[PDB]
């Protein structure tokens with residue numbers, strides 16, 4: 001279990017070949033596991049720092065996790081600057097000791113693919129005339145909970161205000177230090193930023209950040225999100241460039257009988273002009289493909305089974321690693337997701353909603369790595385084969401789903417969804433998401449203030 005610092009999930013084709021080699025020859029599993037934080041993991045390492053350092057990669061006292069950045073913006077030209085900033089914040093935050101681990105993102109509306117509400121500090125990019133002018137700052141997200149411990153809770157980030165580009169690093173540093181100083185000095189399970197904010201208050205925390213940064217926040221600049229999914233397939237970039245996002249189930253890159261996913265990515269890496277981008281949805285973008293090269297790349301991806309069509313449901317589902325490698329796993333996640341979505345796909349077809357999707361996530365234990373606490377339908381592992389079923393989040397990921405059923409099995413989960421999906425298929429308003437529908441139709445009460453109303 002070794003993880004690399006890879007801001008924005010951008011990795012070169014050279015770096016890819018290096019990690020592909022190591023993964024194959026020096027680990028028990030032989031796989032490359034793309035994570036939902038835009039980096040990769042090796043499992044069962046049997047020097048790695050030299051191998052990493054040799055291609056210019058460094059694995060993260062340092063409570064800082066990988067800084068995320070919207071991987072495939074609709075306004076393609078914005079990525080370069082946003083990525084440059086994610087990278088600078090990353091280097092800037094590198095060693096103070098944080099009470100708990102600190103997570104940061106750079107978001108480019110209208111996409112919340114990085115799932116900002118699961119993070120401590122978020123910089124939402126504001127652009128004027130194709131140029132970034134500043135960031136809206138949202139602080140305090142965190143999903144980790146402890147079963148039956150009403151003192152823990154998932155929380156969404158709070159808006160602090162807008163800041164011109166020039167103040168970015170000063171503000172980033174100020175949030176980190178304020179949290180470091182005010183974080184709970186006694187208990188580890190309450191030292192996270194989401195808890196500090198609720199203890200001292202957003203305005204109190206905010207005022208301190210302004211004092212330390214040497215700035216005064218301006219009012220929030222308008223922004224909205226329309227989704228969190230990747231743009232599977234070919235999308236037109238800038239110039240004559242194209243981006244091919246490949247759906248990779250569970251982000252597990254391995255050669256399977258008749259689906260040489262790993263070798264395929266190696267073949268592509270060898271002829272690929274630009275680089276790759278690991279997404280927050282555990283997928284991979286082959287970025288900067290000249291129009292003339294599309295066919296070459298597509299042929300390989302197609303042959304290798306990297307372009308096998310899946311339903312929109314499968315593309316919008318996610319699970320954490322869990323067993324067999326995670327020591328904290330309570331129930332299967334990555335290994336349960338595939339057949340579970342086979343079941344959900346059947347249910348979607350049965351109700352005539354096969355072209356629809358429900359943001360569905362499974363996390364193997366309450367730590368919440370699979371980000372089930374920001375899903376429309378979240379499954380939270382409680383024991384072997386048993387999960388807590390949560391409903392009521394929304395497509396864009398700005399609402400925490402309340403627990404609907406507790407410690408139930410797959411057959412029980414499937415029966416409840418069969419029924420709920422049916423009602424949604426028939427009673428929903430035009431373009432209404434499943435999560436919103438369960439809340440509208442009174443199937444589940446919404447979570448309006450997590451620190452106070454998440455638990456029944």
Ligand code: SRM
Pocket residue numbers: 001003034035036037038039040041065066100101103115118119141142143144192282319320321322325326327328367368369370371
């Ligand atoms: C690989 C990854 C899951 C995935 O399927 O993509 C994952 C995997 C693990 N996470 Fe996580 N976490 C990962 C994203 C997150 C997220 C979601 C996110 O950041 O977008 C969360 C929820 C958000 C949050 O932090 O509140 C998350 C909250 C945790 C926690 C609980 C943190 C807390 O504040 O209490 C732990 C346990 C701990 O650190 O104590 C943890 C622990 C772990 C460990 C490293 C278990 C351990 O401590 O020994 C898991 C490794 C399993 C394995 O065998 O590989 N992981 N984990 C995601 C790796 C991110 C990365 O590259 O660093």
Ligand code: SF4
Pocket residue numbers: 320321322323326327328329330333363364365366367368369370
């Ligand atoms: S949610 Fe739990 S089981 Fe899943 S990877 Fe994180 S710590 Fe392990």
Ligand SMILES: [K+]
Pocket residue numbers: 247248249250251281282283
């Ligand atoms: K995926």
